[PDB]
Amino acid sequence: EKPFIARMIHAFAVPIILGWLAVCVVVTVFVPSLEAVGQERSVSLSPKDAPSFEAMGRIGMVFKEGDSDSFAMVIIEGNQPLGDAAHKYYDGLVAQLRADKKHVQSVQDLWGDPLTAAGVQSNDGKAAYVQLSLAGNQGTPLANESVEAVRSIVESTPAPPGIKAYVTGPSALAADMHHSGDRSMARITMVTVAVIFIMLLLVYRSIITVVLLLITVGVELTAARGVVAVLGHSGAIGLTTFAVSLLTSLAIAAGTDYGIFIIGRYQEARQAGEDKEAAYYTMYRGTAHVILGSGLTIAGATFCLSFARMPYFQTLGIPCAVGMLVAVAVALTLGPAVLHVGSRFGLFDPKRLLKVRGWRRVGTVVVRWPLPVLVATCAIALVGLLALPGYKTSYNDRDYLPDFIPANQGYAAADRHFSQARMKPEILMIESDHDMRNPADFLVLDKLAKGIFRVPGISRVQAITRPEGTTMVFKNKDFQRAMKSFLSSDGHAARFIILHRGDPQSPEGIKSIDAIRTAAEESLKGTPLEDAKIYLAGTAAVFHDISEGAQWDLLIAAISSLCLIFIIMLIITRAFIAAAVIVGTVALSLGASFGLSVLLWQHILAIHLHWLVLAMSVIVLLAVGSDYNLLLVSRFKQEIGAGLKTGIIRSMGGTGKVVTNAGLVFAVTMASMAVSDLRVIGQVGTTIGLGLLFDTLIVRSFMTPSIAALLGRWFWWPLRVR
Amino acid sequence: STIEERVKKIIGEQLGVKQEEVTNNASFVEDLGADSLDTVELVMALEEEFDTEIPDEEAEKITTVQAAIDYINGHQA
Numbered sequence: 170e171k172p173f174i175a176r177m178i179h180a181f182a183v184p185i186i187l188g189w190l191a192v193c194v195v196v197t198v199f200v201p202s203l204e205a206v207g208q209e210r211s212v213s214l215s216p217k218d219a220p221s222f223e224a225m226g227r228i229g230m231v232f233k234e235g236d237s238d239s240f241a242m243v244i245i246e247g248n249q250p251l252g253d254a255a256h257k258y259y260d261g262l263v264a265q266l267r268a269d270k271k272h273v274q275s276v277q278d279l280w281g282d283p284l285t286a287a288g289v290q291s292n293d294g295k296a297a298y299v300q301l302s303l304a305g306n307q308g309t310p311l312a313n314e315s316v317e318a319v320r321s322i323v324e325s326t327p328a329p330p331g332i333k334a335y336v337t338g339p340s341a342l343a344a345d346m347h348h349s350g351d352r353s354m355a356r357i358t359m360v361t362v363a364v365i366f367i368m369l370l371l372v373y374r375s376i377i378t379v380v381l382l383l384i385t386v387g388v389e390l391t392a393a394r395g396v397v398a399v400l401g402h403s404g405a406i407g408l409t410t411f412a413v414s415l416l417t418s419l420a421i422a423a424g425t426d427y428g429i430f431i432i433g434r435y436q437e438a439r440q441a442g443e444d445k446e447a448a449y450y451t452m453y454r455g456t457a458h459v460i461l462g463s464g465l466t467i468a469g470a471t472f473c474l475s476f477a478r479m480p481y482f483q484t485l486g487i488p489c490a491v492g493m494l495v496a497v498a499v500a501l502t503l504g505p506a507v508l509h510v511g512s513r514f515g516l517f518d519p520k521r522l523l524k525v526r527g528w529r530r531v532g533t534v535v536v537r538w539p540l541p542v543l544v545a546t547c548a549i550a551l552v553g554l555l556a557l558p559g560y561k562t563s564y565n566d567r568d569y570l571p572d573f574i575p576a577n578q579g580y581a582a583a584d585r586h587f588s589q590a591r592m593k594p595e596i597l598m599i600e601s602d603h604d605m606r607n608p609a610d611f612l613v614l615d616k617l618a619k620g621i622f623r624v625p626g627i628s629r630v631q632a633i634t635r636p637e638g639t640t641m642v643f644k645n646k647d648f649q650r651a652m653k654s655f656l657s658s659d660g661h662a663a664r665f666i667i668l669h670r671g672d673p674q675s676p677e678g679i680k681s682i683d684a685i686r687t688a689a690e691e692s693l694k695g696t697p698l699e700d701a702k703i704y705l706a707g708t709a710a711v712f713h714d715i716s717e718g719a720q721w722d723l724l725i726a727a728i729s730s731l732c733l734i735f736i737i738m739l740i741i742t743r744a745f746i747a748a749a750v751i752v753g754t755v756a757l758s759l760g761a762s763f764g765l766s767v768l769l770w771q772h773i774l775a776i777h778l779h780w781l782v783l784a785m786s787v788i789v790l791l792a793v794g795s796d797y798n799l800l801l802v803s804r805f806k807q808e809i810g811a812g813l814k815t816g817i818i819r820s821m822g823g824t825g826k827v828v829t830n831a832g833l834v835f836a837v838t839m840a841s842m843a844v845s846d847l848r849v850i851g852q853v854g855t856t857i858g859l860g861l862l863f864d865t866l867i868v869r870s871f872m873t874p875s876i877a878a879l880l881g882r883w884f885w886w887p888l889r890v891r
Numbered sequence: 892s893t894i895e896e897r898v899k900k901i902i903g904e905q906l907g908v909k910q911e912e913v914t915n916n917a918s919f920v921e922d923l924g925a926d927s928l929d930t931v932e933l934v935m936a937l938e939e940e941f942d943t944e945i946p947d948e949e950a951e952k953i954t955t956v957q958a959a960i961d962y963i964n965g966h967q968a
């Protein structure tokens with residue numbers, strides 16, 4: 170049989186090749202590059218409704234010192250204690266920063282005031298810092314401009330002998346994280362292609378087959394990136410360096426797998442003695458629906474990230490979904506089109522005997538004694554959960570970026586003279602309906618300041634009652650500057666600057682937020698300000714919300730993918746139990762991938778998994794893993810008729826070597842992503858790589874065939890099979 | 892087709908022997924080159940092709956093409 174779509178591609182193979190090449194030229198020439206669209210289309214890094222985000226907005230609004238949740242800190246360092254010379258350099262620097270209304274919304278200049286200069290100067294005396302409020306939220310294009318605008322001002326200013334200035338803060342780190350991610354795109358792709366080229370050269374032993382196979386992936390990659398770039402450039406979507414980095418590797422990985430499936434089946438047909446024309450249709454009948462089904466799965470699975478609350482995940486759905494739909498559409502049309510035209514010159518014929526005795530013998534054992542094989546593989550798959558009790562996620566973006574990026578250089582300058590908490594302060598603001606500048610309420614400020622200072626895990630609290638941050642009149646001139654700094658001009662609100670002991674990013678720091686809020690309420694209970702409203706802001710408060718949010722949206726991403734992938738597999742295969750088995754088996758194996766990844770990173774390498782790793786990697790593992798099952802199961806439906814058991818053996822031989830090669834290519838492609846500067850994306854890369862190695866070696870080869878052998882005809886319910 | 896021809900087809904396909912090459916008297920492990928696992932494949936393939944059960948104890952008694960033919964003839968009724 171010759172399906173209609175196959176005939177059309179066969180008849181118009183040539184222009185289909187030109188049609189996609191012309192499209193590649195258009196998106197390459199008339200559309201800015203994806204790594205350049207992301208920079209002008211990046212998304213804010215915190216959900217608009219997070220209590221930390223809105224609290225940070227209120228504190229800025231009430232104190233009239235900005236509207237964004239973005240702040241940057243300028244550290245001044247010297248080889249000797251900072252004298253008057255540093256002050257002149259500092260004083261001029263602050264005035265210059267104030268003049269830039271566009272980017273620097275406010276400069277909380279404390280070091281220039283003797284009444285509070287010692288509050289920011291290092292105990293060593295050789296360093297000091299100033300906090301800047303920047304325009305635009307963290308990670309947005311405006312914030313990256315503001316950070317650069319501040320950074321250039323610091324660089325252009327002439328420093329005294331031996332003094333140096335660095336710019337840091339969450340916004341600076343986010344700006345540098347984006348640049349590092351894009352800067353490393355070329356290295357990831359060059360390594361990926363170079364490794365894949367060498368691997369495919371061993372599998373086929375023919376350079377032309379590899380060259381044409383990789384060229385087709387280039388068209389899929391260039392068209393997928395080109396289409397996503399058009400959307401971003403038009404303002405339709407938000408982007409992040411994770412989406413660009415993840416999209417690029419998925420297109421290369423998935424795009425190559427479709428090429429391996431297409432050639433793998435075509436070459437198998439030629440071994441059977443089929444003519445070039447008949448072999449091409451045999452390839453289409455056997456893999457056209459598998460590629461489409463394995464394509465809608467990755468597009469659908471990644472799209473389920475759009476239900477997550479974190480912008481890191483929410484913005485990751487559509488760009489990957491559109492990227493995979495475009496890559497798949499090319500693979501289904503350019504693939505068979507290139508295969509046919511190549512066949513006209515006899516380029517894609519197999520170079521070596523495609524032996525099958527290896528997998529038929531494996532399939533015979535699995536099918537003859539399926540229950541023991543099922544039990545052994547389930548235990549191996551489940552034993553990965555032994556790493557769950559010791560699994561500790563991390564939120565410190567510093568540790569997952571190069572040591573030399575400017576934000577990290579400035580941070581390292583702070584650690585040399587300050588405690589690690591000084592660059593990540595915590596602000597608590599109480600707002601009421603009364604003017605609190607009266608002395609009676611100041612006692613409550615003293616009470617709450619001590620009470621908040623009583624919470625474990627805090628080092629320092631600054632306020633009107635504690636100008637220096639530790640325990641030691643309305644008319645003194647010096648006090649007036651403090652009054653307008655720690656009290657709102659209206660007097661209805663006051664704020665306390667709190668410093669933890671130890672990095673607030675740590676789970677210990679996150680635990681402090683709840684204690685701080687409870688302590689604040691306890692201190693104010695039975696006081697005139699008992700009805701006040703408490704707002705908390707800063708890194709500890711930010712990641713208290715992210716930690717809670719990152720949990721549920723891992724569940725939503727995982728559960729939604731299972732529901733969606735099952736629906737796709739149910740439609741593709743038309744069999745209920747087969748659809749459940751295809752994805753159910755991969756769901757169990759997630760424990761093996763989680764165990765392998767935690768063991769490699771947290772234990773062997775002593776680097777905790779970033780909080781983004783599991784949600785991003787779980788989506789791909791379910792998607793790609795089910796595709797390999799779909800390829801295998803879709804072959805069962807063909808070979809059945811010769812026997813429910815003998816069909817599994819025959820299909821195992823045909824699809825055995827094909828999936829193994831395709832499995833390793835995808836695993837290595839995601840593993841090569843560890844070359845990125847962003848260690849967060851490298852952890853995702855090897856987390857997916859390790860899982861797909863497990864899926865291709867155990868899930869598809871020993872678990873799925875054993876379940877099919879066990880269930881018999883019920884594996885194909887409600888289809889009538891004998 | 893003929894039951895004997897179908898059995899020979901299955902045997903030849905599994906063991907890589909042509910239809911005319913496989914003989915009634917030939918033995919799988921001694922002449923056609925089978926082993927402890929290719930015989931299991933043979934048994935399962937016959938079971939599936941002819942919708943019949945070869946019990947494990949009975950599996951041992953199929954040592955030649957003929958033995959399979961007699962078994963299936965005595966059970967394909």
Ligand SMILES: CCCCCCCC/C=C\CCCCCCCC(=O)OC[C@H](COP(=O)(O)OCCN)OC(=O)CCCCCCC/C=C/CCCCCCCC
Nearest residue numbers: 174454457458461465468469472490495498501737740741
């Ligand atoms: C970018 C520009 C692209 C320009 C070109 C247009 C695209 C052309 C490419 C491909 C289309 C034609 C080739 C694809 C194969 C055609 C269908 C086919 O072969 O089988 C259909 C096959 C029939 O079943 P069998 O009988 O087993 O098949 C045997 C015959 N092969 O049915 C299927 O594959 C079912 C398809 C639907 C699956 C269920 C879909 C449910 C929804 C999924 C959502 C996916 C994610 C969405 C993300 C949205 C993001 C915003």
